[PDB]
Structure 1
């Protein structure tokens, strides 16, 4: 897995954003996680949705460097969204969300599951600490 530079364009919510990747604006979706909905009517503004968006927005807006890391399988989902592990100043946002109890490990699709165990251990910790989603 290799990390590549990207430029934040706009943070949409806890797990989806728009970035300038390789000179082109694209919307990205975080691999292996699911933060609560704050859009889509068949979900509404779920609990912790606003929280995850806020946590995430601050983290990426104050970053000096953003990097995207694709896994080994497909690089985009059915909606044309890039699928990756995104780091803000070397810190993986995917794991950060899970450790704070603001997202759950979800959508695990082989072979795009390289960091699955790392994220599951962080979620377990969040669970035992009964953090946010886990309270």
Structure 2
């Protein structure tokens, strides 16, 4: 896989952010993670949704460098969103959310699953520490 630079436009939710990628505005969905969301009526604001959303937002807004990393399979979903691992100063946002108990590892779709075991590892630790969603 390779990392490519991007620039923050707007964080929309815990797991969806708008970035400037190769000069174009694009919505990215973070690969392999489900955060509780603030967006959806059938739901409303679920618990830990505002927390997940502020975390992603702060981590990206305070970064020196943001990079996106596409996996081996398809790179957009049916809504036109890019499917990627997003890094803030070299730290994967998708993992950071899971490690903090602010996201679950999603239902995985091969072949987009390179960092799957890494993420499950972090999720088991957050579970062991009874953090946030696991509290």
The TM-score range, normalised by the shorter chain, is over 0.9
Q: RMSD of the TM alignment (CA)? A: 0.6
SS at match of 1:117: helix
Measured in 1, the distance between the counterparts of 2:61 and 2:32 equals 22
- Gaps in structure 1 of 5+ consecutive residues: none
Take 2:51 and 2:37, find their aligned partners in 1: how far apart are those partners?
11
Where 2:119 maps in the other structure, the secondary structure is: helix
Distance 2:72 2:44 in 1: 33
Normalising by structure 1, we get a TM-score of 0.98
Shift of 1:32: 0.0
Moved over 4 A (4+): none
Give CA-to-partner distance per residue, 1:69-109, whole Å, 9 cap, x none. Answer: 00000000110000000000000000000000000000310
Alignment length (residue pairs): 135
Structure 2: how far apart are the matches of 1:2 and 1:94?
16
Q: What TM-score comes out, normalization by structure 2 length?
A: 0.98
> What does residue 14 of structure 2 align with?
14
Residue number in structure 2 paired with 1:40:
40
Partners of 1:58 and 1:94 in 2: CA distance? 14
Post-superposition offset of 1:111: 0.2
* Inter-partner Cα distance in structure 2 for 1:5 and 1:20: 9
Q: C-alpha distance in 2, partners of 1:24/1:39?
A: 24
CA drift at 1:37: 1.2
Q: Deviations over 1:18-67 (max 9, x none)?
A: 00000100000000001101011112100000001111111100111000
Q: Hey, what's the Cα distance between the residues in 1 that align with 2:21 and 2:125? A: 33
In 2, the alpha carbon distance for the partners of 1:17 and 1:124 equals: 25
